[PDB]
Amino acid sequence: ATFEIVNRCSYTVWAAASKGDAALDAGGRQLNSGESWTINVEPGTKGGKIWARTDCYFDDSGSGICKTGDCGGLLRCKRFGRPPTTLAEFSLNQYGKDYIDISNIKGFNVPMDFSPTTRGCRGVRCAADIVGQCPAKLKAPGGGCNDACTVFQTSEYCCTTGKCGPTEYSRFFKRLCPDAFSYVLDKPTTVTCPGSSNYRVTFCPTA
Structure with missing residues (x-):
């Protein structure tokens, strides 16, 4: 499957x-503002x-x-990144x-839009200014808006x-981005697409 990764942000x-235990494609790459990088993800990737x-x-x-999403200090990620990280997730x-x-x-x-480029399902988006509106206690000094699990490390x-x-913190994420998971047991906002669809992940979609 192809994933066109597009950086519409004004920043690199x-x-x-x-x-999680392997890179997809090269695993990582720099995208300057406006650049697109197309990766190939093996069918069956879960x-x-x-x-x-x-x-x-x-x-x-x-x-x-990296200040956000660092994956063991590698350009080419083989593992998941350090929060805070908005995640496009797929199986x-x-x-x-x-x-x-x-x-x-x-x-x-x-902010992110994750949409199919092929027919038969809708995309999902979380493009609200979560960093700007982030609750004080969740702000990541390194940049971004931490989830509450990261900050507080409670079973809840x-x-x-x-x-x-749900929690006061999860509700904040959910309010800003209803179409993304805000906590582990959130009512799912998972979209079912045809098998072997192709996708585009757009960073900063709202230009």
Whole structure:
């Protein structure tokens, strides 16, 4: 499947793509403002994620750091990124269908649209100014808006027991972005697409 990753932000982002224990495609790349990077994700990829990283520095070997979404200091992510990270999440060719969502469960750094480029389902978007409106206690000094699990490490926020409800913090994410997961047990905003659909992830879609 192809995922065109497009940075519409006015700032550079370093896109990342991983399924947690492996890179997807090259795993990461710099996207200057307006750049598009098209990756190929193997059919059947389960639990893949794409995200933006901000304020990154990499040496010639592709080692360094980002202020948001850093994936073990690598340009080419092999693992998931350090919160806060708005997440485009997908599982492909799962009994004939693809499943996509956006999640704020690991916080929010960059606004995102995640849409199919092929027929048969709708896209999802979280493009509200979550960083600007972020509750004081969730603001990440490094940049972005942390989820409450990250900040407070409670069973309730992290849904450790598989028993948790919405919280003042989750409700903030949900209010700003109704169409993204705000906590682990949120009413799902997952979209079912045809198996083998193709997609575009757009950072800062609202230009």
